[PDB]
Amino acid sequence: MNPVNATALYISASRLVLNYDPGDPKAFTEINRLLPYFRQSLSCCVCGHLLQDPIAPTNSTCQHYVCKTCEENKQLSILVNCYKKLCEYITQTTL
């Protein structure tokens, strides 16, 4: 079972950062509003922190994901890495 919330939020966030329009005085606050929700979508249901080694149910669409330390889902892993690199690029450039 793939994660819809996570991928959707990654698309929104990446689209927001990479299309940052220098001229829209409202863009930065938008990115700032969307970023914590994207962060929430990839967090561990035990830790609270960002998923270390994601594991997901296959029978439902629970949207509930836990660490291996706490059925491995590759999409969730790639998305965690995506979050990390997007954060890295956000830190590197100024919006």
Partner 1 sequence: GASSQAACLKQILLLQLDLIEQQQQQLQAKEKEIEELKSERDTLLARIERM
Write the CA distances from 17 to 9, 55, 62, integer angstroms. Answer: 12, 28, 29
- Considering CB distances under 5 to 8 angstroms, the limit depending on partner class, which of Zn ion, partner 1, none binds residue 79? partner 1
Q: According to the binding rule CB under 8 A, does residue 8 interact with partner 1? A: yes
State which of residues 4, 11, 70, 95 lies at the interface with Zn ion (CB under 5 A). Answer: 70
Write the CA distances from 66 to 32, 54, 82, integer angstroms. Answer: 26, 6, 18
Question: Hey, is 5 helix, strand or coil?
Answer: helix
Provide the minimum distance between the beta carbon of 5 and Zn ion in the complex, in angstroms, as a whole number: 12
Question: Hey, is 73 helix, strand or coil?
Answer: coil
Provide the minimum distance between the beta carbon of 91 and Zn ion in the complex, in angstroms, as a whole number: 24
Q: According to the binding rule CB under 8 A, does residue 79 interact with partner 1? A: yes
Per the annotation, does 45 bind a ligand?
no
Q: What's the burial of 6, exposed, middle or buried (CB within 10 Å: 0-12/13-18/19+)? A: buried
Binding site residues, partner 1, CB under 8 A? 2, 4, 7-8, 10-11, 14-15, 18-19, 61, 74-75, 78-79, 81-82, 85-86, 88-89, 92-93
